[PDB]
Amino acid sequence: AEAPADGLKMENTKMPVIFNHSSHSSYQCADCHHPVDGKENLAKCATAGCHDVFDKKDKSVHSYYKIIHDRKATTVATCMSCHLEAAGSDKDLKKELTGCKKSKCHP
Ligand code: HEC
Ligand code: HEC
Ligand code: HEC
Ligand code: HEC
């Protein structure tokens, strides 16, 4: 399958984020779109039954907050766990890629 155009709005919450596939083109699709039940899975992450729990305190597999923001990941990277690695030690990359506000995720 082909990646969609840039400018995709992630908007399940009051803190929506613009996702650009072009900034992630060197990663395999399945690094984010993990298979489910042995089948390709390009479904929206917060689809009912999937990552559909919006309580920030929830740490279950169904937590939408966790799949995006958890600082550590084992099986499937989170946005944050990968951006923490990518930013490394420098202040600017941390600001742009990992910050809660004034970052490229949450301007
Ligand atoms: C990109 C790597 C992100 C960084 C860095 C941070 N957040 Fe985030 N956040 C991100 C996404 C993709 C989303 C979902 C967008 C949508 O609307 O679907 C969010 C959303 C939130 C929310 C809203 C959650 C809710 O109300 O259910 C909050 C409160 C939030 N983000 C907080 C937050 C904090 C505290 C961060 C620093 C540790 C932070 N975000 C960084 C992506 C990214
Ligand atoms: C993580 C770094 C990703 C990589 C690598 C790829 N995609 Fe992606 N994609 C990602 C997110 C966070 C989203 C938004 C999902 C949401 O629920 O908001 C998407 C979206 C898509 C879509 C559209 C889904 C829809 O609107 O129905 C498609 C078709 C898609 N992605 C395909 C795709 C392919 C083929 C990729 C490899 C070339 C690929 N994505 C990489 C995150 C990530
Ligand atoms: C339902 C059919 C799902 C959709 C759509 C998405 N995910 Fe998922 N995810 C689902 C299950 C049943 C699991 C358990 C373990 C497994 O890998 O099968 C997961 C796991 C993850 C994880 C790791 C655990 C966690 O943090 O909850 C991550 C980081 C994750 N999934 C992210 C993710 C993203 C970014 C998705 C949209 C692009 C997405 N998942 C879709 C079920 C389902
Ligand atoms: C590694 C496996 C990653 C995962 C998972 C996610 N991102 Fe990412 N992202 C990654 C790198 C190495 C970079 C720098 C490349 C660049 O062009 O700057 C990025 C960049 C972003 C950005 C800034 C650029 C832009 O497109 O505006 C944003 C806003 C961003 N990434 C968001 C984002 C979200 C919401 C993710 C989870 C759904 C996510 N990234 C995952 C590496 C990786």
Side-chain angles (χ1 to χ4, degrees), residues 1-8 10-13 15-56 58-107:
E2 281 43 81
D6 279 0
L8 196 163
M10 302 184 69
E11 40 62 83
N12 280 294
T13 80
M15 298 286 297
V17 171
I18 303 157
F19 185 78
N20 298 312
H21 278 80
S22 68
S23 297
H24 300 91
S25 52
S26 296
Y27 298 102
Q28 302 297 314
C29 312
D31 287 349
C32 303
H33 303 285
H34 61 80
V36 174
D37 293 340
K39 293 174 292 191
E40 299 299 289
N41 161 45
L42 296 179
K44 298 279 218 71
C45 316
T47 298
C50 301
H51 308 289
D52 65 345
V53 175
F54 290 88
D55 185 359
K56 294 167 63 180
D58 192 275
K59 295 106 165 199
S60 80
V61 72
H62 298 292
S63 173
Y64 186 72
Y65 193 83
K66 177 191 169 98
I67 62 152
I68 289 154
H69 299 95
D70 209 284
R71 293 179 57 92
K72 269 79 172 293
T74 295
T75 52
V76 185
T78 66
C79 317
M80 183 66 71
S81 70
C82 184
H83 283 204
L84 283 166
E85 175 183 339
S89 212
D90 74 293
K91 281 88 186 188
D92 289 345
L93 283 185
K94 286 173 79 184
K95 191 253 206 199
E96 292 160 36
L97 300 182
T98 72
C100 305
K101 195 56 68 165
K102 306 276 284 186
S103 66
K104 292 184 178 172
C105 297
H106 299 300

mmCIF file of all heavy atoms in Angstrom, residues 17-20 23-24 27 68-71 78-107:
data_model
loop_
_atom_site.group_PDB
_atom_site.id
_atom_site.type_symbol
_atom_site.label_atom_id
_atom_site.label_comp_id
_atom_site.label_asym_id
_atom_site.label_seq_id
_atom_site.Cartn_x
_atom_site.Cartn_y
_atom_site.Cartn_z
ATOM 1 N N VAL A 17 -3.107 17.048 16.055
ATOM 2 C CA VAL A 17 -1.741 17.053 15.548
ATOM 3 C C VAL A 17 -1.733 16.757 14.046
ATOM 4 O O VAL A 17 -2.496 15.906 13.566
ATOM 5 C CB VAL A 17 -0.882 16.008 16.330
ATOM 6 C CG1 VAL A 17 0.506 15.801 15.700
ATOM 7 C CG2 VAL A 17 -0.761 16.426 17.805
ATOM 8 N N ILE A 18 -0.871 17.452 13.314
ATOM 9 C CA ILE A 18 -0.711 17.233 11.877
ATOM 10 C C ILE A 18 0.374 16.190 11.618
ATOM 11 O O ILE A 18 1.534 16.364 12.009
ATOM 12 C CB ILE A 18 -0.389 18.554 11.138
ATOM 13 C CG1 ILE A 18 -1.489 19.588 11.416
ATOM 14 C CG2 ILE A 18 -0.233 18.316 9.634
ATOM 15 C CD1 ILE A 18 -1.059 21.044 11.227
ATOM 16 N N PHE A 19 -0.017 15.088 10.979
ATOM 17 C CA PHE A 19 0.912 14.004 10.699
ATOM 18 C C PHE A 19 1.311 13.942 9.228
ATOM 19 O O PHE A 19 0.447 13.842 8.350
ATOM 20 C CB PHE A 19 0.355 12.646 11.147
ATOM 21 C CG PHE A 19 1.347 11.519 10.990
ATOM 22 C CD1 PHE A 19 2.377 11.354 11.917
ATOM 23 C CD2 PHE A 19 1.294 10.667 9.889
ATOM 24 C CE1 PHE A 19 3.314 10.342 11.766
ATOM 25 C CE2 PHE A 19 2.221 9.649 9.714
ATOM 26 C CZ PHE A 19 3.243 9.473 10.654
ATOM 27 N N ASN A 20 2.621 13.987 8.989
ATOM 28 C CA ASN A 20 3.189 13.953 7.644
ATOM 29 C C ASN A 20 3.917 12.650 7.367
ATOM 30 O O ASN A 20 4.976 12.399 7.939
ATOM 31 C CB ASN A 20 4.155 15.117 7.465
ATOM 32 C CG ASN A 20 3.472 16.441 7.609
ATOM 33 O OD1 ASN A 20 2.419 16.680 7.014
ATOM 34 N ND2 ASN A 20 4.055 17.313 8.416
ATOM 35 N N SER A 23 7.792 12.708 6.504
ATOM 36 C CA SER A 23 8.795 12.808 7.573
ATOM 37 C C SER A 23 9.137 11.453 8.178
ATOM 38 O O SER A 23 10.031 11.349 9.027
ATOM 39 C CB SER A 23 8.299 13.726 8.687
ATOM 40 O OG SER A 23 8.109 15.042 8.209
ATOM 41 N N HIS A 24 8.411 10.423 7.753
ATOM 42 C CA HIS A 24 8.550 9.073 8.298
ATOM 43 C C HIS A 24 8.747 7.993 7.215
ATOM 44 O O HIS A 24 8.603 6.811 7.484
ATOM 45 C CB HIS A 24 7.308 8.785 9.153
ATOM 46 C CG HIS A 24 7.132 9.751 10.294
ATOM 47 N ND1 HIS A 24 6.394 10.915 10.191
ATOM 48 C CD2 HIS A 24 7.631 9.734 11.560
ATOM 49 C CE1 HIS A 24 6.434 11.561 11.352
ATOM 50 N NE2 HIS A 24 7.185 10.871 12.202
ATOM 51 N N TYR A 27 10.804 4.585 7.497
ATOM 52 C CA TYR A 27 10.326 3.522 8.377
ATOM 53 C C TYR A 27 9.355 2.627 7.629
ATOM 54 O O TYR A 27 8.637 3.080 6.751
ATOM 55 C CB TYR A 27 9.657 4.104 9.635
ATOM 56 C CG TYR A 27 10.640 4.911 10.438
ATOM 57 C CD1 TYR A 27 10.632 6.301 10.382
ATOM 58 C CD2 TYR A 27 11.625 4.282 11.207
ATOM 59 C CE1 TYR A 27 11.554 7.051 11.085
ATOM 60 C CE2 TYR A 27 12.568 5.041 11.926
ATOM 61 C CZ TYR A 27 12.515 6.423 11.848
ATOM 62 O OH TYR A 27 13.423 7.189 12.545
ATOM 63 N N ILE A 68 0.724 6.987 21.903
ATOM 64 C CA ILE A 68 1.325 8.195 21.363
ATOM 65 C C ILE A 68 2.450 8.715 22.266
ATOM 66 O O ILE A 68 3.524 9.103 21.783
ATOM 67 C CB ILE A 68 0.240 9.283 21.157
ATOM 68 C CG1 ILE A 68 -0.665 8.899 19.978
ATOM 69 C CG2 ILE A 68 0.878 10.674 20.953
ATOM 70 C CD1 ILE A 68 -2.032 9.484 20.043
ATOM 71 N N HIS A 69 2.194 8.716 23.577
ATOM 72 C CA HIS A 69 3.023 9.459 24.514
ATOM 73 C C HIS A 69 3.952 8.636 25.415
ATOM 74 O O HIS A 69 4.809 9.223 26.081
ATOM 75 C CB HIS A 69 2.151 10.378 25.390
ATOM 76 C CG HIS A 69 1.381 11.423 24.622
ATOM 77 N ND1 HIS A 69 0.073 11.242 24.221
ATOM 78 C CD2 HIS A 69 1.720 12.680 24.224
ATOM 79 C CE1 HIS A 69 -0.352 12.336 23.596
ATOM 80 N NE2 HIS A 69 0.627 13.225 23.578
ATOM 81 N N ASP A 70 3.814 7.310 25.461
ATOM 82 C CA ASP A 70 4.646 6.555 26.396
ATOM 83 C C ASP A 70 6.122 6.719 26.030
ATOM 84 O O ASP A 70 6.496 6.648 24.853
ATOM 85 C CB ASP A 70 4.240 5.082 26.467
ATOM 86 C CG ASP A 70 4.536 4.471 27.822
ATOM 87 O OD1 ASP A 70 5.722 4.186 28.089
ATOM 88 O OD2 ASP A 70 3.587 4.296 28.620
ATOM 89 N N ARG A 71 6.947 6.986 27.039
ATOM 90 C CA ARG A 71 8.358 7.294 26.800
ATOM 91 C C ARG A 71 9.192 6.072 26.436
ATOM 92 O O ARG A 71 10.247 6.200 25.821
ATOM 93 C CB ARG A 71 8.959 8.013 28.006
ATOM 94 C CG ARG A 71 8.378 9.403 28.213
ATOM 95 C CD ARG A 71 8.954 10.100 29.427
ATOM 96 N NE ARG A 71 10.408 10.228 29.380
ATOM 97 C CZ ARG A 71 11.068 11.274 28.885
ATOM 98 N NH1 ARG A 71 10.416 12.312 28.369
ATOM 99 N NH2 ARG A 71 12.396 11.278 28.904
ATOM 100 N N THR A 78 6.185 4.153 20.119
ATOM 101 C CA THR A 78 5.220 5.240 20.219
ATOM 102 C C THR A 78 5.829 6.465 19.555
ATOM 103 O O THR A 78 7.031 6.507 19.288
ATOM 104 C CB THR A 78 4.872 5.568 21.679
ATOM 105 O OG1 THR A 78 6.030 6.086 22.348
ATOM 106 C CG2 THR A 78 4.371 4.340 22.426
ATOM 107 N N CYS A 79 5.013 7.475 19.272
ATOM 108 C CA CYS A 79 5.543 8.709 18.704
ATOM 109 C C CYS A 79 6.653 9.236 19.600
ATOM 110 O O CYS A 79 7.733 9.608 19.131
ATOM 111 C CB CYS A 79 4.470 9.804 18.592
ATOM 112 S SG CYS A 79 2.825 9.318 17.979
ATOM 113 N N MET A 80 6.363 9.273 20.895
ATOM 114 C CA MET A 80 7.294 9.821 21.873
ATOM 115 C C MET A 80 8.547 8.984 22.027
ATOM 116 O O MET A 80 9.642 9.540 22.104
ATOM 117 C CB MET A 80 6.612 9.984 23.230
ATOM 118 C CG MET A 80 7.510 10.625 24.294
ATOM 119 S SD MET A 80 7.935 12.346 23.936
ATOM 120 C CE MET A 80 6.347 13.123 24.212
ATOM 121 N N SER A 81 8.408 7.660 22.086
ATOM 122 C CA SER A 81 9.592 6.839 22.333
ATOM 123 C C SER A 81 10.568 6.970 21.174
ATOM 124 O O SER A 81 11.780 7.007 21.383
ATOM 125 C CB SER A 81 9.253 5.365 22.603
ATOM 126 O OG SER A 81 8.781 4.722 21.428
ATOM 127 N N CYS A 82 10.046 7.047 19.953
ATOM 128 C CA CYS A 82 10.928 7.196 18.809
ATOM 129 C C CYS A 82 11.501 8.603 18.725
ATOM 130 O O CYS A 82 12.694 8.769 18.452
ATOM 131 C CB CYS A 82 10.243 6.811 17.512
ATOM 132 S SG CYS A 82 11.427 6.898 16.148
ATOM 133 N N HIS A 83 10.670 9.618 18.981
ATOM 134 C CA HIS A 83 11.162 10.994 18.937
ATOM 135 C C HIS A 83 12.189 11.271 20.044
ATOM 136 O O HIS A 83 13.130 12.032 19.825
ATOM 137 C CB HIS A 83 9.989 11.985 19.008
ATOM 138 C CG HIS A 83 9.230 12.152 17.719
ATOM 139 N ND1 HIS A 83 8.503 13.292 17.455
ATOM 140 C CD2 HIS A 83 9.062 11.343 16.637
ATOM 141 C CE1 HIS A 83 7.919 13.178 16.269
ATOM 142 N NE2 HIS A 83 8.239 12.004 15.743
ATOM 143 N N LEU A 84 12.031 10.638 21.209
ATOM 144 C CA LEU A 84 13.047 10.769 22.276
ATOM 145 C C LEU A 84 14.403 10.259 21.811
ATOM 146 O O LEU A 84 15.432 10.885 22.061
ATOM 147 C CB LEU A 84 12.619 10.054 23.559
ATOM 148 C CG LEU A 84 11.570 10.800 24.391
ATOM 149 C CD1 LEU A 84 10.980 9.862 25.418
ATOM 150 C CD2 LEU A 84 12.159 12.055 25.077
ATOM 151 N N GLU A 85 14.391 9.131 21.113
ATOM 152 C CA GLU A 85 15.620 8.591 20.520
ATOM 153 C C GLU A 85 16.174 9.521 19.429
ATOM 154 O O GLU A 85 17.383 9.795 19.385
ATOM 155 C CB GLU A 85 15.372 7.190 19.953
ATOM 156 C CG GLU A 85 16.570 6.606 19.198
ATOM 157 C CD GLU A 85 16.288 5.254 18.592
ATOM 158 O OE1 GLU A 85 15.351 4.575 19.049
ATOM 159 O OE2 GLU A 85 17.020 4.860 17.658
ATOM 160 N N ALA A 86 15.292 10.010 18.560
ATOM 161 C CA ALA A 86 15.728 10.833 17.433
ATOM 162 C C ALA A 86 16.301 12.169 17.886
ATOM 163 O O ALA A 86 17.221 12.687 17.260
ATOM 164 C CB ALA A 86 14.588 11.048 16.449
ATOM 165 N N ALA A 87 15.762 12.716 18.971
ATOM 166 C CA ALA A 87 16.185 14.019 19.465
ATOM 167 C C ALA A 87 17.514 13.894 20.190
ATOM 168 O O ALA A 87 18.334 14.812 20.157
ATOM 169 C CB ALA A 87 15.130 14.616 20.382
ATOM 170 N N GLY A 88 17.722 12.748 20.836
ATOM 171 C CA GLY A 88 18.935 12.499 21.602
ATOM 172 C C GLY A 88 19.102 13.539 22.684
ATOM 173 O O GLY A 88 18.183 13.794 23.466
ATOM 174 N N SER A 89 20.267 14.180 22.696
ATOM 175 C CA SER A 89 20.649 15.032 23.811
ATOM 176 C C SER A 89 20.497 16.540 23.574
ATOM 177 O O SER A 89 20.503 17.316 24.539
ATOM 178 C CB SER A 89 22.082 14.704 24.237
ATOM 179 O OG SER A 89 22.233 14.898 25.625
ATOM 180 N N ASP A 90 20.359 16.960 22.316
ATOM 181 C CA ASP A 90 20.330 18.398 22.011
ATOM 182 C C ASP A 90 18.984 19.086 22.245
ATOM 183 O O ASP A 90 17.915 18.537 21.932
ATOM 184 C CB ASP A 90 20.916 18.727 20.625
ATOM 185 C CG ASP A 90 20.001 18.342 19.486
ATOM 186 O OD1 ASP A 90 19.782 17.131 19.282
ATOM 187 O OD2 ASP A 90 19.509 19.254 18.786
ATOM 188 N N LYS A 91 19.072 20.300 22.786
ATOM 189 C CA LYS A 91 17.926 21.076 23.261
ATOM 190 C C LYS A 91 16.886 21.386 22.186
ATOM 191 O O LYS A 91 15.689 21.337 22.460
ATOM 192 C CB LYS A 91 18.399 22.384 23.917
ATOM 193 C CG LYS A 91 18.928 22.230 25.340
ATOM 194 C CD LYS A 91 20.421 21.908 25.372
ATOM 195 C CE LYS A 91 20.888 21.619 26.789
ATOM 196 N NZ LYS A 91 22.372 21.502 26.877
ATOM 197 N N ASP A 92 17.351 21.715 20.981
ATOM 198 C CA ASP A 92 16.463 22.113 19.888
ATOM 199 C C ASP A 92 15.599 20.966 19.385
ATOM 200 O O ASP A 92 14.392 21.136 19.200
ATOM 201 C CB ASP A 92 17.252 22.724 18.725
ATOM 202 C CG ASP A 92 17.820 24.098 19.051
ATOM 203 O OD1 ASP A 92 17.391 24.723 20.052
ATOM 204 O OD2 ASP A 92 18.703 24.561 18.296
ATOM 205 N N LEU A 93 16.217 19.808 19.151
ATOM 206 C CA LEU A 93 15.476 18.628 18.704
ATOM 207 C C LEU A 93 14.488 18.156 19.762
ATOM 208 O O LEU A 93 13.390 17.717 19.424
ATOM 209 C CB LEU A 93 16.413 17.490 18.289
ATOM 210 C CG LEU A 93 17.107 17.596 16.927
ATOM 211 C CD1 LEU A 93 17.889 16.316 16.628
ATOM 212 C CD2 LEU A 93 16.125 17.895 15.796
ATOM 213 N N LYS A 94 14.878 18.264 21.032
ATOM 214 C CA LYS A 94 13.974 17.967 22.148
ATOM 215 C C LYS A 94 12.774 18.911 22.130
ATOM 216 O O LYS A 94 11.631 18.478 22.260
ATOM 217 C CB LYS A 94 14.703 18.025 23.495
ATOM 218 C CG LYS A 94 15.634 16.838 23.761
ATOM 219 C CD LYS A 94 16.460 17.047 25.033
ATOM 220 C CE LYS A 94 15.652 16.752 26.293
ATOM 221 N NZ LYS A 94 16.433 17.052 27.534
ATOM 222 N N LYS A 95 13.039 20.194 21.913
ATOM 223 C CA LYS A 95 11.985 21.197 21.817
ATOM 224 C C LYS A 95 11.037 20.903 20.655
ATOM 225 O O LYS A 95 9.825 20.943 20.824
ATOM 226 C CB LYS A 95 12.588 22.595 21.660
ATOM 227 C CG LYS A 95 11.586 23.724 21.806
ATOM 228 C CD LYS A 95 11.255 24.402 20.500
ATOM 229 C CE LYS A 95 10.814 25.838 20.750
ATOM 230 N NZ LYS A 95 10.074 26.372 19.576
ATOM 231 N N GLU A 96 11.598 20.608 19.486
ATOM 232 C CA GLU A 96 10.806 20.375 18.273
ATOM 233 C C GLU A 96 10.063 19.050 18.237
ATOM 234 O O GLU A 96 8.961 18.972 17.683
ATOM 235 C CB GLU A 96 11.699 20.442 17.036
ATOM 236 C CG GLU A 96 12.249 21.824 16.746
ATOM 237 C CD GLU A 96 13.457 21.777 15.849
ATOM 238 O OE1 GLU A 96 13.487 20.914 14.939
ATOM 239 O OE2 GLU A 96 14.373 22.603 16.056
ATOM 240 N N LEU A 97 10.686 18.006 18.778
ATOM 241 C CA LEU A 97 10.171 16.659 18.587
ATOM 242 C C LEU A 97 9.534 16.037 19.817
ATOM 243 O O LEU A 97 8.760 15.097 19.685
ATOM 244 C CB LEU A 97 11.261 15.715 18.058
ATOM 245 C CG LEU A 97 11.913 16.058 16.710
ATOM 246 C CD1 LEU A 97 12.928 14.986 16.352
ATOM 247 C CD2 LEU A 97 10.866 16.174 15.600
ATOM 248 N N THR A 98 9.860 16.539 21.007
ATOM 249 C CA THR A 98 9.401 15.867 22.230
ATOM 250 C C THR A 98 8.621 16.758 23.203
ATOM 251 O O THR A 98 7.988 16.258 24.136
ATOM 252 C CB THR A 98 10.563 15.190 22.993
ATOM 253 O OG1 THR A 98 11.381 16.190 23.598
ATOM 254 C CG2 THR A 98 11.428 14.308 22.061
ATOM 255 N N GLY A 99 8.640 18.065 22.973
ATOM 256 C CA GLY A 99 8.004 18.993 23.905
ATOM 257 C C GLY A 99 6.481 18.944 23.912
ATOM 258 O O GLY A 99 5.850 18.627 22.910
ATOM 259 N N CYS A 100 5.887 19.282 25.055
ATOM 260 C CA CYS A 100 4.430 19.219 25.217
ATOM 261 C C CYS A 100 3.711 20.386 24.567
ATOM 262 O O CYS A 100 2.515 20.311 24.272
ATOM 263 C CB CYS A 100 4.064 19.155 26.695
ATOM 264 S SG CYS A 100 4.879 17.805 27.576
ATOM 265 N N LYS A 101 4.448 21.469 24.372
ATOM 266 C CA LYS A 101 3.923 22.674 23.756
ATOM 267 C C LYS A 101 5.104 23.337 23.073
ATOM 268 O O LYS A 101 6.234 23.140 23.494
ATOM 269 C CB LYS A 101 3.319 23.585 24.830
ATOM 270 C CG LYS A 101 2.421 24.695 24.318
ATOM 271 C CD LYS A 101 1.270 24.178 23.468
ATOM 272 C CE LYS A 101 0.264 23.376 24.274
ATOM 273 N NZ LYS A 101 -0.995 23.213 23.495
ATOM 274 N N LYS A 102 4.847 24.105 22.011
ATOM 275 C CA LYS A 102 5.913 24.743 21.226
ATOM 276 C C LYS A 102 6.765 23.708 20.488
ATOM 277 O O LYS A 102 7.898 23.991 20.081
ATOM 278 C CB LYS A 102 6.801 25.638 22.099
ATOM 279 C CG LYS A 102 6.028 26.669 22.887
ATOM 280 C CD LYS A 102 5.756 27.910 22.063
ATOM 281 C CE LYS A 102 7.013 28.759 21.942
ATOM 282 N NZ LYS A 102 6.747 30.051 21.258
ATOM 283 N N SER A 103 6.222 22.503 20.339
ATOM 284 C CA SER A 103 6.855 21.466 19.546
ATOM 285 C C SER A 103 6.143 21.352 18.206
ATOM 286 O O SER A 103 5.073 21.930 18.009
ATOM 287 C CB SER A 103 6.794 20.125 20.276
ATOM 288 O OG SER A 103 5.456 19.674 20.410
ATOM 289 N N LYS A 104 6.723 20.580 17.295
ATOM 290 C CA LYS A 104 6.083 20.365 15.994
ATOM 291 C C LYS A 104 4.818 19.516 16.103
ATOM 292 O O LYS A 104 3.938 19.597 15.256
ATOM 293 C CB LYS A 104 7.066 19.783 14.978
ATOM 294 C CG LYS A 104 8.151 20.796 14.610
ATOM 295 C CD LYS A 104 9.081 20.286 13.534
ATOM 296 C CE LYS A 104 10.102 21.362 13.193
ATOM 297 N NZ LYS A 104 11.146 20.830 12.280
ATOM 298 N N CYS A 105 4.711 18.715 17.165
ATOM 299 C CA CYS A 105 3.461 17.994 17.414
ATOM 300 C C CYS A 105 2.399 18.934 17.976
ATOM 301 O O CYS A 105 1.276 18.992 17.465
ATOM 302 C CB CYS A 105 3.681 16.865 18.401
ATOM 303 S SG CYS A 105 4.819 15.599 17.820
ATOM 304 N N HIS A 106 2.756 19.647 19.042
ATOM 305 C CA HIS A 106 1.835 20.564 19.703
ATOM 306 C C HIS A 106 2.421 21.992 19.645
ATOM 307 O O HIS A 106 3.061 22.445 20.599
ATOM 308 C CB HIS A 106 1.586 20.175 21.179
ATOM 309 C CG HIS A 106 0.961 18.818 21.400
ATOM 310 N ND1 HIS A 106 -0.272 18.456 20.893
ATOM 311 C CD2 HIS A 106 1.373 17.771 22.163
ATOM 312 C CE1 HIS A 106 -0.566 17.225 21.300
ATOM 313 N NE2 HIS A 106 0.414 16.783 22.077
ATOM 314 N N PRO A 107 2.218 22.706 18.519
ATOM 315 C CA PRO A 107 2.706 24.087 18.458
ATOM 316 C C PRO A 107 2.024 24.990 19.484
ATOM 317 O O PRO A 107 2.676 25.892 20.019
ATOM 318 C CB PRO A 107 2.343 24.536 17.037
ATOM 319 C CG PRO A 107 2.039 23.321 16.279
ATOM 320 C CD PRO A 107 1.577 22.278 17.262
#
